[PDB]
Chain length 308, copies 2
């Protein structure tokens, strides 16, 4: 029970793709039709954008272990013959891919710059190959360890963007320092690791208008800006206000100022007089909050302040 060319396959990781300095293994399974223990007709040759002498470490039972490691290139032909016959696998062609580079690959994003404690930090890893070019696709094993305040671990989420890019996300609940180490093949890649600062983070949507100020520039009978004060200055705000505080100030230099902290739900109208006459565009209307969720047991009063 000498061999069969045909009913005897071959299989393995490495007759399916490749990588620049990584070993490419596969296994021959000799059959007659069925079964097997160490006859020796098989022979492998590999031509491609290099030379490649492949080892056929061979036999025991009717199996054979072949390995070759491509030295950086794309497509390789593999011919598997049995006593000068084509095994029921071949000829067959694999495509070897370049190899990513530990310090030819970097990361950018606001995630390695400056992080708030109430919004997710982002950034991208950039995959370069051995030579210099940038990786087309993915399947490269990059890793991301995050160690923040109080040493504690932070679980980053790496997303294979199928190009030679991977997206990174993480949450930094506490203000503190965060060490972000991004290794390739367990080797800290471009300028990795690196500290990152996270600070307390304003929360827009729940954030409040405090105070307001508007200034008038008093005009005299000539049509020029006055240069001292002295005029009667009255500011009237009218609306619904769980709270108010208003100010009518004579900045004693030609101008008058109103300073007020107003809070409520609705639309508002402020009357402004200089010597008992409205200024150009008084009153003026505006709106803060929402006239809905607004209280019922609210009046709509009129606050007044006057200056000497």
């Amino acid at each position: 029970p000498a061999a069969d060319p045909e009913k005897s396959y071959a299989e393995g990781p490495g007759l399916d793709g490749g990588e620049c300095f990584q070993p490419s293994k596969f296994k021959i399974h000799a059959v007659d039709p069925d079964g097997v223990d160490g006859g020796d007709g098989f022979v492998v040759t590999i031509e491609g954008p290099a030379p490649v002498d492949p080892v056929m470490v061979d036999n025991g039972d009717g199996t054979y272990d072949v390995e070759f490691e491509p030295k950086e290139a794309g497509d390789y032909v593999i011919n598997l013959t049995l006593d000068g016959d084509n095994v029921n696998g071949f000829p067959k062609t694999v495509t070897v891919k370049p190899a990513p580079s530990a310090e030819h690959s970097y990361a950018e994003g606001e995630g390695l710059v400056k992080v708030f404690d109430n919004a997710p930090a982002e950034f991208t890893i950039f995959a370069v190959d051995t030579k210099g070019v940038a990786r087309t696709d993915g399947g490269d094993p990059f890793e991301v360890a995050i160690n923040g305040p109080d040493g504690l671990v932070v679980d980053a989420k790496v997303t294979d963007n199928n190009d030679g890019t991977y997206g990174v996300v993480y949450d930094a609940p506490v203000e503190g320092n965060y060490n972000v180490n991004v290794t390739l093949r367990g080797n800290p890649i471009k300028n990795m690791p690196i500290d990152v600062k996270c600070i307390e983070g304003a929360n827009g949507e729940d954030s409040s208008f405090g105070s307001f100020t508007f200034t008038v520039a008093a005009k005299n009978k000539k049509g020029e800006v006055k240069t001292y004060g002295g005029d009667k200055f009255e500011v009237s705000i009218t609306g619904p206000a769980e709270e108010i505080t208003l100010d009518a100030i004579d900045n004693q230099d030609g101008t008058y100022t109103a300073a007020y902290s107003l809070v409520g739900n609705g639309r508002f109208s402020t009357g402004v007089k200089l010597n008992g006459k409205h200024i150009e565009g008084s009153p003026f209307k505006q709106v803060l909050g929402n006239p809905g969720k607004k209280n019922p047991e609210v009046k709509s009063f009129t606050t007044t302040r006057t200056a000497n």
Copy 2:
């Protein structure tokens, strides 16, 4: 002469004052004539006793004076040989005499005046007894001098109650000597120096700048105590001129200071990290939309902090 056809006339037999001379003249007729005889007699009955001085005449006229000393109502008899003359007895009301040491003036036009508005005060006539005059017909006068020895005419009105309203124009800044008089004597606290100042013209004035300041809060519901946050300010509208500024007061407060000149309706977006605040946007209205430039197409002015 005869009682019926001869008649008296004059000021003082028509009304009176206190410490003013009441004067009237008698015309003896026969019918139609007169030269002296005598026959005429006068006595005043009143709240106080009075002695009329009658100056008998050249031609058939008489001159009688009698000034009323205390005041109200006085009766004037006029017999001729014991025979009421054809208008008698008569009734005259002496009113109290205004005093220049007890009448006084008040109004903001004695305090502080603007060069762009009429100044006003009131006179309060007080009588010689220190009782507020009741009614008018008092000859109070007003002399105002302005700053280059200019002359301001004041317009005095007679409130028909013992007071008199006054208005004047102090058209230039400087000082204004206000002097109110009564038959030549300055009333109490006169004259007075009044400072007039340059007046603001409200209807022609407007807004220069604007500011508002948000208290940033974190997630734990508290207020922050420093900055760091991206704070963005955006103004949309028909802006004819504008300047904006987003400021981190680096204490967890942010400020927007802007100067807007425009003719329409405006809204303003305020983002504490790419997320509108508890009112953003707030809409204000400025300048009449109908008068603006026929082409000012509203746009967006944006300014960012961090």
